[PDB]
Symmetry: none
Subunit: 107 residues, 12 copies
């Protein structure tokens, strides 16, 4: 029910470039936000849990800032292995809803 | 982080062929299992929760059952629109963990 | 001289979506940042100068802000017309260095 | 403001003799003219500034000057590596208007 | 014999634009050079002769420049009917060599 | 000016026959008539100067004759390479005039 | 059966444009050459015989000359009524043989 | 002078149909009659020479009977390649006069 | 049965011209041949019967003659009225077979 | 002689029921009546003779008879392929007069 | 209910001609059939009723034929005023069905 | 006969209003009045039988009422499909009579 609006739809960046991606909660998801990396044909992996906390084993190069209905994802220094798809998912209340997803390509 | 296990990884069934995919967990993820349908290059969407609870709008043909450490998803008659990859995910304990996923191809 | 890095290269998004871009200067380029939008076949066209100020003729949708080294350009609501390439160019010292450019697209 | 007018919009040669390009200013502009080349794809790389002074690393094949209002740019020997689109930019004051541009060819 | 090398071969300019064709002769010559305007399906017509002297009638915007081995043909204001191909012929020594040609199209 | 009359406009025949073109002059220009080969979009090219004298390189197939004010052109045997527009120009007085041309072509 | 050879196959001349068509024979067809004028869908009619002898009623503008193995037909001023196909034919020796023919079009 | 009257003006016939065409000599042409086939845009070819004799290489299917002022042409068995125009020509005395011509079409 | 072939189909001729038609019978139809002229919208109208005999009401211009298998119908002088279609019909055995018909026209 | 009178001259139907056509004789004619159909374009093809006996290959849909003086022809079911014009011919004796005819339609 | 199928829809006959319309009823009926003559811009007038019984006054040439399910309307002599459209109505059972119609035009 | 009076002759109104037509009878025909729909050249069609009773298929917009010798017709709301001539026929006695009709039409 809660609409998640994520931008941009597609991306590119030279190695080591400051990337940012956003999701827009149609309602206040109270920071209940998780970030996922979906490699080319694999299950989604959890990066952040509740707006800004990273999962253990996840580099500090990946980060998230946010509040209210605006959270953001950053890959300070892009990397080849970073090529994937990042989705956000409000887990504030079921139906748990993913944002559209951001393809992330290296030029 | 409860490990999940899906199977199989791909299945070519035929128009109207009953499919049964299974996700096995590593703890009593209780009733906190959710089944997603993800179409080519689109965001995983929620079809069912509480191991078997359809979300309001889903075709009846999707049914889910099983409890505790094992769960099964079912599509009685497999229609065109269903060619998607189906993943499960446990919303019982962070990090909300998915299953390996299954690629449902048509025959 | 003064090296400009612009992020990202290309970026397809949809209408109304916020679009944010950045570009960093090799050294302090204290407020002297021009943003250029360039449509194919046409030539660079001013929109903002001094990093924040908009050339009197640009929508209030296009905006620029940034603190002394890291500047960001923002399109609050993509409208099909915005299909172009934007270049950030520093003019604190000659040669005036533009950044790599960001091709914004529809999808 | 200051309107620039370059000529032509397309301009060719079989390597050697002259490649001249017109760029007429809308009012006196000291000699704060500049010349960029956009090797189609990348961003503009400037060759001359202050009307006639080449930058560092730029071939003796490229030149131009004039004053007041009229400036011609010459490629005094078309080399193949010189495929590009050249622009002129008055930088007397803001906005920094642009010359329509010229697509230089080889034929 | 004498070898005339014209440039460019084709160029795009607009109404009001200043085009410039250039023609170099293999040897010195004083002024035995002619400029012709061959219209699409017609025989060459004489514009300027002896370099800068222009025949009776030819519009004021037509000019030839030169005093030895380097000459220029200028169309001050490029107009809809000025579309043709231009030529440089040396009537100094026989055979009467022509420069290559500059087909002039509008925009 | 000296009015020139060339004929015909067009001429189409087989790769082996005769192509005889004529040119009359408003003034017996003595013997100051030239013969050109105008291949599809290449500058004119001298073939015969002063009614009959062939220039070096010219194949005997092409001959010219004519006294005072009436001259004819003649390719004894048409070769496929002879596809062009053929022009007569008088180099007796000024301005140098031409005849409409003759797009000689095979069938 | 004396082979005959006409040329050219078609010619666009202008109102008042002198036309010269030639028929070459393979033996001394002597003076036994005849020139016909054939209008669209009408019977070839006789304008001249004995290589050059006008038939009583023909416009003076038709003249024929040449002798032995070569013959030419002429129309000094080409008028409207003349758009026809002109063939020659030898009445020297059976089978009375024509020439390839020429299509005289107007310009 | 001698009028040749040929009938019909136009014809048609299924493959293999007995065709006859006539010419009427206004004077007794003493069998000096030739038949010609004029294919769609080609020179006239001689079929018969002197009322009834065929030219060598001409099928026997084509024939001619006649005397005095009445000769006839027959194509016993019409054929596609027979599509043409047949004219008769008295060659008894100049002016050699052709009959009007018979278009011959296949239905 | 008894097959009738009529030649030719259509035939445009001019006034006073002889017009001759034929039609052959598959086997001996010893003298029993009717000729029919049919004007558009009207119906077949007798003119001759028995091959030679004319129905008392027909011009002496229309005639028929023929030896046992091959019959010919002749119109000595076409007059505009004769625009019709003629059919030859055998009546030596039922079914009485007409021939294909000959549409005679003006031109 | 014997005058036939058919009715109507035009006669239609929407396929199925009856199509009757009158043809009244001028005197007794045994039963030597005949019925032809001229599919517009081609010649008449007979269907019945001796008043009521069909020919070989003619559909059972076509019939007719009567005697003495009156004969009606019926199409007992209008088929589309039956567009035509039907005639009747008395063949008692000569001339073989015709019935005015009837243009059968479908509407 | 009962379904009357008339035929033909239109016919052309001449003065003195015998027209015949036919009308079939869906079921048996004894004679409850009427024939009407609707004149161009008028209400239907009753001609024959109960099939063959004709109303007082109607001209003698009018007749109806029938005794069960097949009926015919005959106009012995088609006259100038007989031009109308005819109809068949069954007053056996309600609703009172009509046959289609036969518009009768003269010639 | 029973004289019928219908009114009016013509009636023109808008697609939505009322069309009320009347019919009086020379004899109170009791209730044996019928109502027809006469669409441009199609057989009549029953609408109401015995003053008021609608036949199956008939839309209620059309109603009828009337005792003995005076009946009215009524389309409550005129629809564009109702374009026709409307007739009254009495089926009480013989011969069955009608009223002039009523070409009801829009504007």
């Amino acid at each position: 029910d809660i609409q998640m609006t994520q931008s941009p739809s597609s991306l590119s960046a030279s190695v080591g470039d400051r990337v940012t991606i956003t999701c827009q909660a149609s309602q206040d998801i109270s920071d209940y936000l998780i970030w996922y990396q979906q490699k080319l044909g694999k299950a989604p992996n959890l990066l952040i849990y509740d707006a800004s906390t990273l999962e253990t084993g996840v580099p500090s190069r990946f980060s998230g800032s946010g509040s209210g209905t605006e959270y953001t994802f950053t890959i300070s220094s892009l990397q080849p292995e970073d090529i994937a798809t990042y989705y956000c998912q409000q887990y504030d209340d079921l139906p748990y809803t993913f944002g559209q997803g951001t393809k992330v390509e290296i030029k």
